[PDB]
Structure formats: structure tokens, C-alpha cells
């Protein structure tokens, strides 16, 4: 077992990361899947990683971390960032359906989003919700926001997109594909399972498909300040992008280190924005 | 076993054999490979599975079984058939490069063919060679024959194609793809490794590619007499095909049983043909 990981490693060495992700997406279609949010084969209950002031237990929006697609990710994704919200805001990390190796994969993105929506609404209660995601997780946070609005009549109070690269601005992901792939292998707490690599490929494909809806929630765009890899100035702007953001905040670090070594800066931008 | 095997199992269940084979081929591109026959991995030394009469050892053609693409196959493929050649003809089985991951996959078909050619010519000596293959192996036998002729200055003395379904004539085998998939699992002596499933996908892709060269070697076309699945005579002939074969022989059984339960019939047709050809 583990052939997908082996092929993956080779693809990165050969600078064919993008091509391999397509293969993962195609292969993933043959994994058992759940067609109903209710038929989800796993507990999506968010985990409380930080607690806000017990004092003003009034309305106050709660932060919900939308786990990204990285096959090397999981419950550890928001550990560093969340510490900065302790005594400031409750922070709930919600799992992405299909990971954690017999977990069923979602038949389509909306089905996975509904499963998450239900777990989130139950956990948040009457508190307003502000979704937060990084990279693939940022793209998922927005899709989730729109779903909550249209299928659960509950649009979040806001969306925090950390370093998103939406369709239309994928040149940096293409140019730095090798670093994005190496970054995945680096920082892996354990070897990525083929099941999780398949899940990653499936979500990547979901995010590339027709996604009409735009959330009415205000968005905070948090951008890395340093390029992940070499970039020829003539190509244009390598920085992350979102169309018509409510606020834009720049933080130190690159696509990866902005969260790894400068999470406090990210948290700081979020808190100041929430107050406003 | 491996994830690819698991996925393939599901693909077959869902009747999506063709689609998964395509996935296997695409994935095989990320496996280490050899671009030079001299750079090949394993030893392709043909194995002697049957011995012919000692009374003659100079002009009699020797049979060379060309291993097929099945990920569950290997050294076992021609065992049952070879039995009928004992005391009749030497029967050598040549491995298909890339199977047992470790084993490097050929960069292209010609590279694998060249590796096989070298091994076969070394083993055959001055004895003429008649290539024999079943299904995918039949297509491979002809491709090998052409390469032998075009790049090794040695066309084989003949080619035995057992139930080939060449490009332009594979609708029956595509319609019956589910049974092909079930046959693979229903025939494993051990779980098919993901490495061999990838090799199988890569060769399948090779054989679907453009290969205009036709061997000048005479062809014996052996066809199964029973359909592997449902067909409906309105659809046309479901049988295996080859353009203008020198001789055609029909044997009992289907695409698969012809090489098991009815292997003696296949061997009989071959021996009979070798005599007429010689």
C-alpha cells in the first residue's frame, strides 16, 4: 500500500505536481461515497480550540476554522493560530468530510458543505459565525458561507480568507507547484495515506467546477507578504486575491509560513477586523 | 492490499473497467521507467516450459509464449497450454517487462519489445521462432514480430494469435469489459499489486496507440467459439479478429476457457499449423 504517496513524491521530483493532482481527482471517483449529508460516515462535531471572554457571554461572533484539503492536515491545522484567540473569541475547528482510511467521500461539494453546516450550527448555537480558512480552506470557507446562506438560511457574519487563490488567479499555484508539493511532504506528521491523498484530489476538483453563488457576508482578505518561490515580475501580481473584499490585511511570511511562523499576525488582523 | 487494487475492484463492480484502466495508464506515468532496452530492469530470460523431440534440433521452429498484460498473470500463464507441447515442440515463455513496485516500466512499447527480442534471440539460438500470445498477449506477439523484423532483421517464422481483439474490432471485448475485470480478480493467486495494475494500464495504453507496421510472418488465428457475455446477433459477429490470417482455427470455450479447459484444442491447432507451415 501507499502507491499513491509514492507516485506523488515522484511527480513532485519531476515537477508534475499539477498533473498528479488531476490523477488523484480521477481516481477518487472510485472511492465509496455519501450522497446525503446525513449519510456522512464520520463525526463532524467541531472542536473548541480557544475560548473567548466568559465575561461578555453576549452575542459575540464565534470563529469557525474550516479545515483545508491538505492530505497532511487534520485536527492540528489551527492549533498555533487558535492560541491567539484564547480570551478573545471562541474558536471552533470543523473537520472536512472524507479524511480521518474508510471515511466515505462526498458525492459532491454541496453534500459535504451541508454536513459541515449542520455540525457548525449545532455547536455555535445562537452566536453569529465567522468562517476562517487558509488556501484551499479559504476557498472552502466561502463555498460553505454561500451554502449556509442559501440552504440553511444562515449567512455567516463574515468570512476570513487567508491566502486564497481562486480560479482566475491560479498562475502562482502553477508556477510554484513544485514548492506547493514539497511543502505538502515537508511538515507531514506522518506519511500521507492514499485515502487522504484521494480526498485531497476530489476536493481540488470540486473547487475547480462551476461555483455560481457569492456569499453576502463581508470578507477579510489576509495575504502573505513574501513569495513562496521565484516569480518573474512581468507575470503580474503573485499575491493572493479575492474579488471585492471588505478589508485587506497583509502579514509577514509566505503562503506557508504566514500561518506557520506568523499566526499571531493573522489572528491580530482578524480580531481588529471583527471589532470593526 | 493496495489502494489501486481496491479502487479497481469497485470500478469493476460499477461496470467502469475502461475508465479505470485509463486512470491506471495516466498514473503509470509517475512510475520510474527504462528508456533503453539495455536499461531494462529484470532478467527477461525465457523459461523452458516444454521440450520437443531430441531427434530434431536445428530446423524445427520453437514456440515462444508472449506473456499478456493481465496484472494477475505472469509465469503461470502458459502452464496448462505448454503441457500439450511436451514431446512436440520446445515452448519458451518470455516475461513482459515491468511486472514484479521495483520493476521499472518501459518508456514506450518499442523499448519493452527490444528488450524481449534480445532475450528471445539469445535463447532461441539458430532455431526459427513462432510467437504465441493470448488476447492482449496476442496483440503484443504481433507487435513483437514486427519489431523483430524491422529492428532486429529477423522476422519470426510465424505468429499464433489466440483470440485477439485489435483496434477497430474491440467492441465485443469492451462490451464485456465487466467480465474481463471479474476474470482478473477471479484469477488471482495473490492480490494484484498496485505496481502490476499500473504496468497493465500502461501496456493497455500502448496497444491502443497508432502502430501501422504489419509483420510479414504468417498468422494462425485461433478463435473462441462461445461468447463471453450477452451479445444479440443483431449486433454482428462477436468473435476475435485479424486481417487475412494464413489459417483460422475455431476451438471450444470462450475468451477465457479456451486457454484452460480447452488448452489441448489450442495446442492441437498450433501443432497442425506448424506442420503445414514447415
Curated annotation (Swiss-Prot), chain A:
Changing residue 135 to A: Loss of thioesterase activity. Unable to catalyze the biosynthesis of the 14-membered ring macrolactone narbonolide and 12-membered ring macrolactone 10-deoxymethynolide. Residues 71-271 are annotated as: Thioesterase. Changing residue 178 to E: 10-fold reduction in the kcat/Km for ketoester. Disulfide bonds: none annotated. Substrate binds at residues 69, 136, 163. Transmembrane segments: none annotated. The active site is at residues 135, 255. Homodimer. Pikromycin PKS consists of a combination of multimodular (PikAI and PikAII) and monomodular (PikAIII and PikAIV) polypeptides each coding for a functional synthase subunit which participates in 1 (monomodular) or 2 (multimodular) of the six FAS-like elongation steps required for formation of the polyketide. Module 1, 2, 3, 4, 5, and 6 participating in biosynthesis steps 1, 2, 3, 4, 5, and 6, respectively. Involved in the biosynthesis of 12- and 14-membered ring macrolactone antibiotics such as methymycin and neomethymycin, and pikromycin and narbomycin, respectively. Component of the pikromycin PKS which catalyzes the biosynthesis of both precursors 10-deoxymethynolide (12-membered ring macrolactone) and narbonolide (14-membered ring macrolactone). Type I modular polyketide synthases (PKSs) catalyze the step-wise condensation of simple carboxylic acid derivatives. Organizationally, type I PKSs are arranged into modules, wherein each module is comprised of a set of catalytic activities that is responsible for a single elongation of the polyketide chain and the appropriate reductive processing of the beta-keto functionality. A minimal elongation module contains an acyl transferase (AT) domain, an acyl-carrier protein (ACP) domain, and a ketosynthase (KS) domain. Cells lacking the TE domain are unable to produce methymycin, neomethymycin, narbomycin and pikromycin. This is Pikromycin polyketide synthase component PikAIV. It comes from Streptomyces venezuelae. The gene is pikAIV.
Amino acid at each position: 500500500a501507499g502507491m499513491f504517496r509514492a507516485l506523488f513524491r515522484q511527480a513532485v521530483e519531476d515537477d508534475r505536481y499539477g498533473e498528479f493532482l488531476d490523477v488523484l481527482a480521477e481516481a477518487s471517483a472510485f472511492r465509496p461515497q455519501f450522497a446525503s449529508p446525513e449519510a456522512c460516515s464520520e463525526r463532524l462535531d467541531p472542536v473548541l480550540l480557544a475560548g473567548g471572554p466568559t465575561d461578555r457571554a453576549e452575542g459575540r461572533a464565534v470563529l469557525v476554522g474550516c479545515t483545508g484539503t491538505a492530505a497532511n492536515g487534520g485536527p492540528h491545522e489551527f492549533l498555533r493560530l487558535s492560541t491567539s484567540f484564547q480570551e478573545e473569541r471562541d474558536f471552533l475547528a470543523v473537520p472536512l468530510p472524507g479524511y480521518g482510511g474508510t471515511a466515505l467521500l462526498p458525492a459532491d461539494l454541496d453534500t459535504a458543505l451541508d454536513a459541515q453546516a449542520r455540525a457548525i450550527l449545532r455547536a455555535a448555537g445562537d452566536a453569529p459565525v465567522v468562517l476562517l480558512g487558509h488556501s484551499g480552506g479559504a476557498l472552502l470557507a466561502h463555498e460553505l458561507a454561500f451554502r449556509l446562506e442559501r440552504a440553511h438560511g444562515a449567512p455567516p457574519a463574515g468570512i476570513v480568507l487567508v491566502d486564497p487563490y481562486p480560479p482566475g488567479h491560479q498562475e502562482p499555484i502553477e508556477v510554484w507547484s513544485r514548492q506547493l508539493g514539497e511543502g505538502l511532504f515537508a511538515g507531514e506528521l506522518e506519511p500521507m495515506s492514499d485515502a487522504r491523498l484521494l480526498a485531497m484530489g476530489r476536493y481540488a476538483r470540486f473547487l475547480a467546477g462551476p461555483r455560481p453563488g457569492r456569499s453576502s457576508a463581508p470578507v477579510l482578505l489576509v495575504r502573505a507578504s513574501e513569495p513562496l518561490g521565484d516569480w518573474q515580475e512581468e507575470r503580474g501580481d503573485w499575491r493572493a486575491h479575492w474579488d471585492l473584499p471588505h478589508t485587506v490585511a497583509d502579514v509577514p511570511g509566505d503562503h506557508f509560513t504566514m500561518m506557520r511562523d506568523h499566526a499571531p499576525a493573522v489572528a491580530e488582523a482578524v480580531l481588529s477586523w471583527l471589532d470593526a
